[PDB]
Symmetry: C2
Subunit: 399 residues, 2 copies
Amino acid sequence: QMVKRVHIFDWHKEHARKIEEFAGWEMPIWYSSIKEEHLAVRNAVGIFDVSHMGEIVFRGKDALKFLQYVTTNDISKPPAISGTYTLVLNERGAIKDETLVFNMGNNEYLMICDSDAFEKLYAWFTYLKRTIEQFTKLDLEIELKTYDIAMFAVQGPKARDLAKDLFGIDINEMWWFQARWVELDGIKMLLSRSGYTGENGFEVYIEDANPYHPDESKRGEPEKALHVWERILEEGKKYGIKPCGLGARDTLRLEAGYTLYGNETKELQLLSTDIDEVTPLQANLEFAIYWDKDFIGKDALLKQKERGVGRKLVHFKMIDKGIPREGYKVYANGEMIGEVTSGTLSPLLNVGIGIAFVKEEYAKPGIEIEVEIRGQRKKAVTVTPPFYDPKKYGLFRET
Amino acid sequence: QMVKRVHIFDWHKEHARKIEEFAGWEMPIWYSSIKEEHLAVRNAVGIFDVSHMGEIVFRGKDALKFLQYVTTNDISKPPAISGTYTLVLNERGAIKDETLVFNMGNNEYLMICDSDAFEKLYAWFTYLKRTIEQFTKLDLEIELKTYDIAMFAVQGPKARDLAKDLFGIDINEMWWFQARWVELDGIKMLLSRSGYTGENGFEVYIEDANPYHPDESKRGEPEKALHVWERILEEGKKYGIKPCGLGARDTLRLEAGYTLYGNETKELQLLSTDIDEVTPLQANLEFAIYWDKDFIGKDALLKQKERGVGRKLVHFKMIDKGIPREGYKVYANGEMIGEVTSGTLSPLLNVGIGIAFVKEEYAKPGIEIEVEIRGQRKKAVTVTPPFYDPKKYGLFRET
């Protein structure tokens, strides 16, 4: 399998202290340190290259109805140009991926999905489209744009001032998930107010040549993407900006409490049952479901409500030392209640924090539990995210 | 939830020595012994109750085209009434299930599928159908008939004589997978020349009331199914027929070398790739693929040929003592090459036999390998199935 590399991979290879395979992409894990980058986002501003995230575009008079049946939320709600968080479920209710769909206007929709799931999603949607086309003509085009679009995330309490310096816009006047077309030094790009850190911020989407594009005929110097990257670091210097790798991306999202597909959410294609896992009901993502419409996997969710979800996600923080990690067994009163799905050392708290999938009766805050780390039972307690004080950190901190 | 039980479960409860809840169903594992039942099929004839296998019926003028796009083989070839072995793949080429589809004539198709996969398949086909229906009307109805249809398999070198006595037909005049309507004491049923043992044989499908039907309102006494079962045992007595449980069903299929969905074949929904596992190319099931048409998962298979399958199934038999079992590590030429997917003690050879998923370069016969069994590397050798002597046992025996 070909290794996946983002447009400005060379810049990362030259500046990152650690480059390693992530979702098949050779990505920068950190440049200075995970702690410094994490705190830069919490205290100032940081920029992440997330060009590895998937981008799938749907165009045509039949795009809306198609997206309405294959995803869980009301795709007709967001006005152009803005998005909505929506899940893509399989035939028995499990999550194929968590996504963000933007209504770009003119019957065009842009879906941002996970780097570890975009190939599956593209095949999914493409074969669903071809299945329909065996019986009727459709006005629907589905194009994979992951390798064509460079995407950067600028996050932190200073991201707003930085965006003002760069584009002359105030992201605070935009609602979350709203987007708009902007330009920087002659370079056109889409800008959305969004993020994966818990802080205020924005993300830009740039169409540019990728020297590592799978399609040899589409390869070229990432002149535009690199220019924007360097310009943001330039204008961000006055704010103490730092380039941030995937290490801090994970510590920041965990502190905020966000799920990560492949860890908290996934599809197991379980044998011998009419309800697959993990479903939105087991991951506390029911808010992403518009129940008054039909969609793939809906029947299984209705059945799951009648029987009980069995297991649910729960956030927890360590009391003793040890960093919880995926797979570690979790106990309560001596009885095994589940396993850790994500874990890491919080740069803010300076104690391990994580998420676990446990018997649903334990998915509540304030419960004393134990996590087995390398043969040792380490104490922890369940909590309600975020892990930080929302009055001090995060986009809603007091001013 | 309700424990699933076949139509004539009460008969099994009264005649089996071992009944165990396996995968949501309370089934007979053996009546006399696994060895005796295994040998009865190899030397005489045996009858298995496989009423737990799935049955999904497709009806309508659009059924053929639908089945052609969602399965791998050429569904248009079997004439009424006969079937074809066909695979159902996911969007990235992995196997959702191995199935047998019969052309019943007059826009009707009967699909026999795995007990551990029929709920997934029904949801899959139903949602594909509903997705199409969002854009156009269809003449297609898909019904789950698993609980309505009792199914028995009669296998062994004397199965042919037994079918002659019972129905007045000669299965040797039928091609494999061919079927026809037969009648016994006024009870009409479908009969196919098929089997999961490696021996000659037939299977009957009987629509009858199920006292353990999930739908309470449909429950009734299985008079027809029980009558047929008892009559087969009655007429089979002269041939030394024996009722056979799930234990022998597994030893016989493994000895013949057949794959078992959930073990050899399965869909992992792998992250970060455009090709899922396990595909037909990895399970040596390419013969079930009609390449000239388009079908769900085809692209992934074409790409897999370009890059190489990586891993393939291989059959092996123990030289040293010990029984290989699912999960055991396999080694060769000083390195780990894979893991066992199925293993058992061959009642006929009295040595361990199994199938393993290994690095493709080792998926050849005559290779000396080792299987880790309870901390010891036990010697084994890869072979070409079946494990039994095809001149002495199986459908092609010469005497």
